Structure formats: C-alpha cells, structure tokens
Symmetry: C2
Subunit: 241 residues, 2 copies
C-alpha cells in the first residue's frame, strides 16, 4: 500500500492489480477542471501506478484493461493534483500513467520526493513539487517552497517522459538520466503561480545548492535557482565534503 488516500472528501479510491500496480480512481474534477486528490502516503513501486482519467473502458499500459472511472461524471480532469498532506516523503520507483484523457499531473509533497526509475505516461506536463499547493477562496492559486529545505532527489535510474517536466523544490540532487520534452527546474524558497511563474523568493537561512550528475535529453532545459549564496553544481557521481 504505497498510496494511502486521505479519509476526507478529496481522498480518491485506490486498489491494486496483479503484479502490484496501483490504480487510483481520482476524485471528480471541480469547476477549474482540477481533480484535487489528497493522500496520507504517495509512493510508487517498481510495478507503477495508474491514475484513472478515463470516460470509457480501455487499455492501460501499466495495468492492462481497465474500466472507466465512475467518479468522473462525463468530464475528465484537466489537471490531476496529488497532494501529500502528512509528513511522509514520497518515493517514486516506477512509472505513473494517466489512463484515458491526457492531463496535466502534479505531485506535491513538502517532505521530499525521490524519483528513481520513475516516469510519466500520457501527461502533457508533469510537475514534482517539494512544497505545498496554495488555495484561496477554494481555488488553486499556486505553490510554495518557502521555509523548506527538503530535497527533490532523482536517482541513478532516472526519470522519463515525453511531456513537459517541472522540477520544483528548495534543492535538487539528480544522479541519472532525465528525459522530457522540456525540463524546467526552479529551485530555492519561492512562491509560484499555478503556471509556475516565480512570484516571490526568500533568502534561505543556509545554502540551497542543487547538484546534477548524469544526463539530460530534452528540447529545452531551464534552471533557475533563486537562493542567494547558492548555485548549481555539476559534479560527478559523488559530491564529497
């Protein structure tokens, strides 16, 4: 049970199929088109996980044949926002697939996210946010990495997608191959709009250097570290003191 939904009204239904692949019947999208799913734990194992955004039965790459998601009510999600609300970090050790209608994907976990052999299938854009979503008056206003020093770690088995990729965290430590249509890595302690415009930045109490080793295969790479006194280190497979 790597994925454990919150017991409240934004907790989706989660089950597993043979091999261990988890299937998430995401919650009904709201008027903004956002399926806002809340979790006590969000972790993906080697067998992967499927987010069911399908209006009709069909074939999932990771799970096989699947039924439509009856939570949808005729309208698929535009954005699938997965928010870890507890203090548990997330480990993504396999692929995640949006089954059905392609959508944007966000995973927010201010406690940390580790990817190692992860990836995103049938997503137009996938964003990993070591931070929290910001809501005001019931609407998604953006995201915050303020007052946070936790890591977005990417391990030696890398991260693959053919959609856009955002890596949003106080700091990043990447050691593998990242493939995406475009890679945007925005680091430091920031507030963001829902589009990942940087709206404000804090000076951190201590340095927030990000480290990249491995490779990047993409059409465009953009890296912005807003933290004063910090930078982007391109090191080898180890970074010793």
């Amino acid at each position: 049970n790597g994925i454990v939904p919150d017991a409240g009204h934004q907790g989706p239904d989660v089950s597993a199929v043979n091999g261990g692949t988890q299937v998430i019947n995401i919650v009904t999208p709201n008027n903004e088109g956002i399926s806002h799913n809340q979790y006590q734990d969000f972790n993906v194992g080697k067998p992967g996980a499927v987010l069911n955004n399908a209006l009709e039965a069909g074939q999932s790459q990771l799970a096989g044949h699947l039924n439509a998601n009856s939570n949808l009510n005729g309208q698929a999600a535009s954005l699938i926002l997965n928010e870890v609300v507890s203090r548990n970090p997330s480990f993504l050790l396999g692929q995640q697939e949006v089954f059905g209608i392609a959508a944007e994907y966000v995973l927010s976990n201010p406690n940390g996210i580790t990817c190692d052999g992860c990836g995103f299938i049938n997503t137009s854009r996938s964003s990993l946010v070591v931070g929290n979503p910001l809501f005001e008056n019931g609407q998604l206003k953006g995201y915050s990495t303020l007052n946070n020093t936790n890591l977005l770690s990417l391990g030696k088995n890398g991260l693959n997608t053919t959609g856009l990729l955002d890596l949003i965290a106080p700091r990043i430590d990447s050691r593998g191959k990242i493939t995406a249509a475009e890679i945007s890595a925005f680091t430091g302690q920031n507030t963001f709009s829902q589009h990942f415009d940087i709206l404000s930045s804090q000076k951190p109490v201590s340095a927030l250097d990000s480290y990249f080793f491995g490779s990047m295969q993409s059409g465009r790479i953009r890296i912005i570290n807003t933290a004063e006194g910090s930078g982007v280190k391109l090191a080898g497979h180890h970074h010793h003191h």
Copy 2:
C-alpha cells in the same frame, strides 16, 4: 602577439602595455552600430585585453589610464563583433574589458574557442560563437554553426561576467565555474538570427554531446541542444570512453 588584426579595412589597431595587456582600438562602428573587427588570430593571455570603446580618456581596469579611441568619431559602438577569419582557434586565458561605453560583445571563431580563466568586464552581453557571422547586403543577419563539429571549451579556471552570456557552438565541454547574469547555451548545428533566435537546425553526421562539470552561478540558465541523437552530459571531472 596573441591578437593579430586582418590587414584589410576591418582590421583594428592593436598594441600592448606593460605586463602584456593588449589594447584594441576597434574600428569605427557602421550604421547598425556594429564595430566589425576582423582578425587572423584572436587570443588573450593571462594579462587580458581591452577593447577601446571610449570617447574620452579614462581608467581601464586591466590596462590603467588610456586615451580615447580616435577611430570612433563621436559615436561609440553598440555591438563589438570580433570575427576570426583564418583557420586558427582562439584561446582566452584572461579577462576582456570594454573600456568606455558599455557594449555588447561577440567573438566568433568557427575553428574553436577555449576559455580558461576568462571573463568579460563592462559588457551588457557577451557571446562566444564557434561559428561564423552571416552577412547579406552588407548587414549582419545572424550566425551559423552549420557543418561544424568544433568545440567551445571552458577550462577549470572558469568564466566570469556580470552581464548576459551566450555560449553558441556545435558542442561545449565545460569543466569550471561559469558566472553570469544569465547563461544561454545553444548547441548543435544551427543558423541563428542576430538575436540568437534559432532559425534552422541540421542533423549532424555524428553525435554532438555537450559536457558540463563544475558549477553555474547565474540568475537563469537555459540550454538547448538541437542535435538529434545527442544530449547534455553532466559528468565528473573526467569523461572516459
């Protein structure tokens, strides 16, 4: 004599001061505001080099007190374009300073450029182009890295500027600290506008991977490798076969 001007009408006057610092009295700017300087050799040693864009005498950081550049005729250059027209590559082992009116700076050398401890003082933007400028009807139309596999190398002593920085080459191999207001690295075999818009791209005969080791300290980093079958490698201090 690291810097040797072309004998023709776009060859500037070059001399040296005590310590070996070279001083270039750049050619009169044309109607586009471009001082287009052509060289048989362009190399900067540890003592550095000064591009004289001054309308009045004053104090250069690298060379001391200097006279105004009498080639200017009351109008300073907006862009100082330094074009190596021979087959000799360029080695930049010290700082380059635009003395006088701040300007944009370009060095084009399709044979290769190596920076090691180089930097750019009093430049709003500095661009290192392992390629050629393109002229049509007497005007600067842009730049080309087509049909070229030469390197832009940045050594362990790095490259520093407080202005914008463009690194434009078939491939880049960087091993030091790059500091700039923004870093834009556009690699592959491309044509560019005068603003470094990518206008076209070729598929190279063989892979053109770029390698970065060291660090980047900047407000924004953008990397675009247009070469199919190639990528951006973040390796350690060596990249062994």
